[PDB]
Design an enzyme around this catalytic site. Sequence first.
Site, mmCIF file in Angstrom:
data_model
loop_
_atom_site.group_PDB
_atom_site.id
_atom_site.type_symbol
_atom_site.label_atom_id
_atom_site.label_comp_id
_atom_site.label_asym_id
_atom_site.label_seq_id
_atom_site.Cartn_x
_atom_site.Cartn_y
_atom_site.Cartn_z
ATOM 1 C CG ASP A 130 -2.300 0.689 0.848
ATOM 2 O OD1 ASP A 130 -2.317 1.909 0.544
ATOM 3 O OD2 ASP A 130 -3.335 -0.021 0.844
ATOM 4 C CG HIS A 193 -4.344 1.281 -2.741
ATOM 5 N ND1 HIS A 193 -4.877 1.311 -1.469
ATOM 6 C CD2 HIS A 193 -5.393 1.407 -3.589
ATOM 7 C CE1 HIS A 193 -6.187 1.480 -1.545
ATOM 8 N NE2 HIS A 193 -6.525 1.544 -2.820
ATOM 9 C CD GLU A 258 -14.042 3.327 -9.580
ATOM 10 O OE1 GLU A 258 -13.180 4.019 -10.167
ATOM 11 O OE2 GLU A 258 -14.725 2.454 -10.161
#
Length: 469
Positions: A130, A193, A258
């Site tokens: 992430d 991410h 999204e």
Amino acid sequence: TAQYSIIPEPSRTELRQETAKTLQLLSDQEVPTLETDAYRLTVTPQGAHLASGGREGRIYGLATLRQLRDQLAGQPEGIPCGVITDKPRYPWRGLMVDPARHFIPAADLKKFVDMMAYYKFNRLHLHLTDNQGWRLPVPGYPKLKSVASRREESFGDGIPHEGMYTKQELKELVAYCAARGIDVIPEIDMPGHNQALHAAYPEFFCFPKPDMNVRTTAGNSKELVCPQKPEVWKFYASVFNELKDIFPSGIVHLGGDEAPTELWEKCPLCREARTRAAMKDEQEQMKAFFAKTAALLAKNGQTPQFWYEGNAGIYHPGETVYAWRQGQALQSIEKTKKAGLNLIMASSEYCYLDFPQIQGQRNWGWMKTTTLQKCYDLDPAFGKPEKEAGHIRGVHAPVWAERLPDLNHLLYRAYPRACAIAEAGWSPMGVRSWENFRRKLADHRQFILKRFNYDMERTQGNEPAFRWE
Ligand SMILES: [Zn+2]
């Protein structure tokens, strides 16, 4: 009247009016008259008899026997004799941990796994990458270790945070889980991410920024890998080959929520690629990105999973998606049925265990409260019958770790709500009730204290202290 305190509640319990003071296993047989995920445990004054339809059902039967032994240890007068016949409502019963946000050392993962196996979970999902960190080693990309696995602090606390698993540690984890009936599912989010990836490999992105650092706060990143760059597809092929070597489940969660596409819109490479392909906008580009990734996975014998986005369009029939948006559970059940998708229920109204469990506990300025009783309200099918909602594979509870810095904090928010999730994934509605679950969980405080040396008591004031705000 005397009863058992097994969580999840078995699909059938027939008690007898006699008492057992021993649970010595007297017989242990595999029989074709039970399903492979099913068992029958008979408790008699002389000891217990176990029959199972296969290795999986046997693991579950021994887990039930383990809970009964904990109950008997607390009840010297004995426990009731009876017959438990049991098999799970759903085949997917999962928890997700988030080492990308806060690294979870191997020993701590083992404890987490033992606890989830106690409640018959069978899926462990690892959020490996992430904005705040990258935890998967990939041969040939050393900056993932030297840059992407480290950050300078968290939320201004001045305390560096770092970590990366070794391949050997991840194969140990896979074997450890397999021995406890749990499959392991890696998640590598793309194309977003990816602030940590950008910190290590800015050349993978539309607008490389060499001064980019691993993120130390929450929020959304606009940094998407550039699908026009060959290094990106070579990198992800390498990633997926490592996952193939390490994770025999063959499932790869790609994220898929999204992403902001402003930078794709501005990228001179992506602009001309969209023109060549007659793509109208960046959503068509996103569909193409995921078709290419799905083809790479398929060449490897792997299959993708996604956080469901109702209007995404990136899914092919047969794929599996997770329902997570509040208020969208029933709509997602209908939409996935029409789309030929399989669905795992992870609705944040019930299943997002990063949220505080008692009103007034830290909500970081945005989280709603999800109490144990609210969590137990979850029916994964939301009232629909098996014949109408057969594409629902089960339940999944993410324990997002932006604000959970160690195992003590992690378990404080994961439990006891994970016990409720376990019963929602396992137990038929006809044997479920809040009053019965609450009684059993009261007993489980002592069970878990004795077996795991861990305290599941929850009051408004006894959450471990945080360093932030
Ligand atoms: Zn680009």
